[PDB]
Symmetry: C3
């Protein structure tokens, strides 16, 4: 069985003083298509393979290709995946909760380097023999994530640095907790990174949360993000502040709104200020299909 | 929702004295696949994204990729599209009416340079930041087309030449009229091009038409194409003559036939003579799926 | 009509002393997706086009593209195909019968060079104007195969070497026979190769066969492969020995098993020894979807 799903997104992307002789405002857009093949068995074991084909404005050669395959096996709530895997630090809950705008960005996101699913090919050739193994599992309302990423599996292992990550999250109906930890993240030796986050649903309509991170060898240092959102019908308002230890950094912040036009259609915008005083703004749509 | 459609075509392509040590006759063939994702809303607004994957004999690396995305929004007969758009000069009716053979070619087609939907990637990198906006609408039996193409939207606009085009066509059951006009076509400054055409369905089986063009800065000069077709059951006969102002040019002409073998299957051939006395012939099939 | 099918495979691939500073054991995996468009007619003629998108671990740029199109026409048991065709030497029965392991390999396979369907693009550019014509037909339980492959159809034919192949196989319920012959195989002048094979189903569960080959200009010389398999429920045991004329070559051999876990799911392994004493082992899964 083969199924196809994905999403399109387009709108305006403003970056104050982008560059000498550059336009600050552009039309940014993304097409994402996923090809999924699955084999269900009567034994209860499911086999799967996924490929992504992603295009973004500005991409080299005005063309689209697929990425590197991901394969998995699922049985009784346990999923083992091989190849281009989702990593633990990139999959836990709460870590991307401050993202806003139609491009889902936030300076409140972790300012570290770590491996994550690769959406596209990489012309530099660095991903050619990259191969990860991942394992996910769910006890009660607990989600467990584990991932092992080998940047070049053909080369003797004593010569390459492997990335290892673990994460768990948990949620009842009002509190959410999450934590992750990865060593040698992004294959950078000694770049050990951590995350702890918690959220409180103080209503059917509002939630506040707080994320803390150890950014490893990044120049950002430790970081804290405080965010909150509130829904008024089909409209959601979101905001966040974030600080990093880097001397002289500014406080980053953002304010945005989401409007659920229809099932599968979402109009979003935001105005954000980064740690180096960058001003960024956006407004556009996402539709899922 | 994701749907796939497209077509295959193959047959013989003859070019008299193609080149020293080249074969005049080859097997030319094309595979075109379109991936379309759509999101229908109960509000009446439809969202869409399309990608094309096209392969042609002789293509570099013996491979296929997708092109650059096209996105659109439709509401009440109005469609706005962004990215790799169809342009006004390329979409009006009647402008390609003389095309024949299984490759749908004609020297009677406009001999100018103008932007059009890009089927494939471009290795030269010229299309990397190309971005168009297009708008179509239909009053009675009137079709209105408008398009704005920015060859490099990241660069300050005072440095790049944008293409702007408008077109309309109209048809009752016997007369057809169409006109288009585009300035700085193909991003060439001062290359303003125009088209006017008209057709007369003098029967259920026969039609005659005439197309005139201002080819802008091309060396062809103004051009006139006179064509006609006539259907005998599943068989269609077509012919056209065309002249350009270029001194010493020959009159171009073509004669071909189409045979509708089955729904979705069409066998075509033609013999054409160009403006520089080139002799070209073809015979093959197209099937849609 | 467009349909999608394919398969995923993953597991461990061991090559004794692969290379200085290389890992002998890797995770090898393959994702194959086929896109097939067909047009059925009421006349009985079917038109088809196929494209493949294949990714393998270690592939350049960590990406996937499609290959070169294949087109065909089928009528009354006769199929003519154009472009990236299956060749006669690569399609006859019995020639790959000794293949085992989850990667379906065998040193008992023919050690010659010959054209075959191209799965992927080729960066070297050698396949750019490659074009084959193929014809298959089936009398009783007879299968007839014919193929003509032109490595560069744009160039004058007196300058290029074309590959021509024929094959037939036949089977009742217990004996199988097959033979093939191709001249200038792989476009190498004078590299004429041949194959004869026969198999005996000495049970519902067991089969023994023997394949002989003239490897043309290869350094292997003539070759003989003797193989056998036997099924015990969902488990299949397979083995083969193979010899080549090359002086000092070793006898190659392999032993493996296949376990049919479920419809569409197959777990395989093997231990093989090549003609130069190479030791290779594998274990993994294949699932079809
Ligand atoms: C500002 C640089 C020049 C680009 C022209 C800006 C014109 C804006 O777009 C007009 C046509 O519509 C498409 C743009 O996508 C963004 C629209 O807002 C998203 C839906 O709420
Ligand atoms: C990103 C999708 C893959 C498409 C990119 C292929 C890149 C090919 O170019 C690599 C650079 O070398 C130049 C190639 O020669 C011409 C390419 O093909 C011609 C028709 O579009
Ligand atoms: C300056 C060039 C144009 C690009 C900028 C578009 C940025 C537009 O503003 C972003 C949206 O601001 C969100 C407001 O926060 C309040 C939310 O509730 C109000 C509307 O539903
Ligand atoms: C002329 C150069 C060498 C190529 C051989 C020409 C042989 C013609 O094709 C024979 C096999 O069939 C496939 C060709 O596609 C064209 C057939 O006509 C189209 C359907 O009406
Ligand atoms: C046109 C479809 C895209 C496929 C073209 C990829 C072009 C890659 O080559 C660019 C030129 O540089 C050489 C690349 O190194 C080898 C490529 O991949 C090997 C297996 O086929
Ligand atoms: C010379 C190498 C072969 C390639 C050339 C094939 C060209 C064949 O002729 C094209 C078809 O000619 C069309 C004829 O116009 C009359 C139409 O009605 C008659 C048949 O239905
Ligand atoms: C040996 C080099 C380092 C690679 C680690 C080997 C660990 C083996 O895999 C553990 C995780 O599972 C995925 C591997 O695919 C092969 C499993 O066997 C196939 C099914 O029978
Ligand atoms: C194999 C699938 C096709 C993808 C390969 C495209 C190969 C492009 O590189 C050719 C070598 O030249 C370097 C290209 O410049 C950067 C590429 O695109 C950037 C984003 O991934
Ligand atoms: C040495 C690193 C690991 C990689 C090697 C895996 C190789 C494993 O063995 C292959 C399977 O051997 C097949 C045995 O033949 C007997 C068949 O019946 C028994 C089991 O069903």
């Amino acid at each position: 069985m083969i199924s196809l799903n994905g999403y399109g997104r387009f709108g305006l992307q403003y970056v104050e003083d982008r560059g000498v002789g550059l336009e600050d405002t552009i039309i940014s857009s993304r097409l994402r298509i996923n090809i999924v093949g699955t084999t269900e068995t009567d034994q209860g074991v499911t086999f799967g393979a996924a490929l992504a084909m992603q295009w973004d404005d500005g991409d080299a050669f005005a063309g689209t290709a697929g990425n590197a395959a991901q394969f998995w096996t699922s049985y009784n709530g346990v999923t083992v995946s091989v190849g281009n895997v989702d990593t633990a630090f990139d999959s836990v809950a709460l870590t991307y909760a401050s993202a806003m705008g139609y491009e889902a960005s936030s300076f409140g996101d972790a300012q570290s380097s770590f491996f994550a699913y690769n959406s596209k090919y990489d012309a530099s050739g660095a991903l050619d023999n990259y191969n990860g193994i991942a394992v996910t599992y769910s006890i009660s309302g607990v989600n467990l994530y584990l991932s092992y990423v080998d940047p070049d599996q053909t080369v003797d292992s004593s010569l390459v640095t492997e990335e290892f990550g673990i994460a768990a999250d948990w949620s009842n109906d009002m509190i959410s907790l999450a934590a992750a930890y990865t060593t040698d993240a992004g294959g950078i030796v000694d770049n050990d990174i951590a995350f702890v986050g918690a959220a409180y649903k103080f209503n059917d309509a509002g939630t506040v949360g707080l994320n803390w991170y150890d950014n490893g060898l990044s120049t950002a240092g430790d970081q804290v993000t405080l965010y909150g959102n509130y829904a008024f019908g089909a409209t959601t308002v979101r905001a966040y502040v974030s600080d990093i230890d880097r001397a002289g950094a500014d406080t980053a912040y953002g304010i945005g709104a989401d409007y659920q036009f229809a099932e599968g259609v979402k109009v979003s915008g935001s105005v954000q200020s980064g740690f180096a005083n960058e001003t960024v703004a956006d407004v556009g749509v996402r539709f899922d299909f």
